[PDB]
Design a binder for this molecule. Structure first.
Ligand code: HEM
Ligand SMILES: CC(=O)Cn1cnc2ccccc21
Ligand SMILES: CC(=O)Cn1cnc2ccccc21
Length: 289
């Protein structure tokens, strides 16, 4: 399958900056969500889940087709909770209905990361909505109850290497788990994008426990948690070295995350040679808004 980026007709950087700004302003406005975490983290998770269905072998899934809007994918057990992100984005789409669904979902994740003081994430437009029969089947997103070998193999399907995997996982600095969504008991949560996932992994005193949903997770006396797939990053010595690097270099983590997250959001898309260059959106704060 070939999916060629096609710019929404007549649109340019300023059109997309307006969408970014509407998302950003709504993020500031709807601050009470999920015990005052706000919607930033769920929007990052949504952008990842709409992209993480990709399969490099046949170019099925991926962000291009905007297929999360269809019930099969919307109702994926792996996507439980993301409906909150979809609902947040609904008025934005109503205000800017020219934007494609995949462009909106991916842009929501970019905006969330930046507005949460994360790195700039260059972003390209041109995803085109594809029909219902292009929706990938459920089961392509990763399990949390698994080990480092599973994580490494899993992410090969998304064409991600060890450093890309470890950098992407740093998004677990954000937000929390919810027992009703995923069967994992949430711990201390934040809504600022930092390298704190790596610091938390290395510095806390972790104990393996079984939660009320019968699932194992690692818990600290300080009140934090890690998934078994998170903790795998310090069990595997390849991943461990990279964890240590990002715990000790905030700029390097930012730079590597930005590249990996752009790549995740662009997997499966062919950009014509005369497509616009990636856009780097200004934050509300940079605009004085
Ligand atoms: C092995 C890979 C991964 C697994 C198994 C995994 C699993 C999970 C689980 C179980 C949750 C809790 C969902 C809920 O209960 O609401 C979660 C939340 C989250 N995940 Fe991941 N994840 C992985 C990779 C990623 C990546 C690559 C990103 C993005 C770059 C990401 C971003 C997030 C965010 C931001 C949240 C918090 C959402 C919220 O607070 O509502 N995750 N993840
Ligand atoms: C309001 C609307 O046009 C619905 N809609 C159509 N595509 C969308 C993508 C994200 C959120 C909502 C979306
Ligand atoms: C600060 C921290 O690492 C919190 N955390 C640790 N693992 C997580 C999984 C999903 C969401 C958040 C998670």
């Amino acid at each position: 399958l070939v999916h060629v980026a096609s710019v929404e007709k007549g649109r340019s950087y300023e059109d997309f900056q307006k969408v970014y700004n509407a998302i950003a302003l709504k993020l500031r406005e709807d601050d009470e969500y999920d015990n005052y975490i706000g919607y930033g983290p769920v929007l990052v998770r949504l952008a990842w889940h709409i992209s993480g269905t990709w399969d490099k072998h046949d170019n099925t899934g991926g962000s291009y087709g905007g297929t999360y809007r269809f019930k099969k994918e919307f109702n994926d057990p792996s996507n439980a909770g993301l409906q909150n992100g979809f609902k947040f984005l609904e008025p934005i789409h109503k205000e800017f209905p020219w934007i494609s669904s995949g462009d909106l979902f991916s842009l929501g994740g970019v905006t969330a990361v930046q507005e949460m003081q994360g790195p700039k994430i260059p972003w390209r437009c041109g995803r085109v909505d594809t029909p219902e029969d292009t929706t990938p089947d459920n089961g392509r997103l990763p399990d949390a109850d698994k080990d480092a070998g599973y994580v490494r193999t899993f992410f090969q399907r998304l064409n991600m290497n060890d450093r890309e995997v470890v950098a992407l996982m740093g998004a677990h600095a954000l937000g929390k788990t919810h027992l009703k969504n995923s069967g994992y008991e949430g711990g201390g949560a934040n809504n600022v994008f930092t390298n704190e996932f790596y610091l938390n992994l290395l510095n806390e005193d972790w104990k393996l426990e079984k939660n009320d949903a019968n699932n194992e997770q690692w818990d600290s006396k300080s009140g934090y948690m890690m998934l078994p797939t998170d903790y795998s990053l310090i069990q595997d010595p390849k991943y461990l070295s990279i964890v240590k690097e990002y715990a000790n270099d905030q700029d390097k983590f930012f730079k590597d995350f930005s590249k990996a997250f752009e790549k995740l959001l662009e997997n499966g898309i062919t950009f014509p040679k005369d497509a616009p260059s990636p856009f780097i959106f200004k934050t509300l704060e940079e605009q004085g808004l």
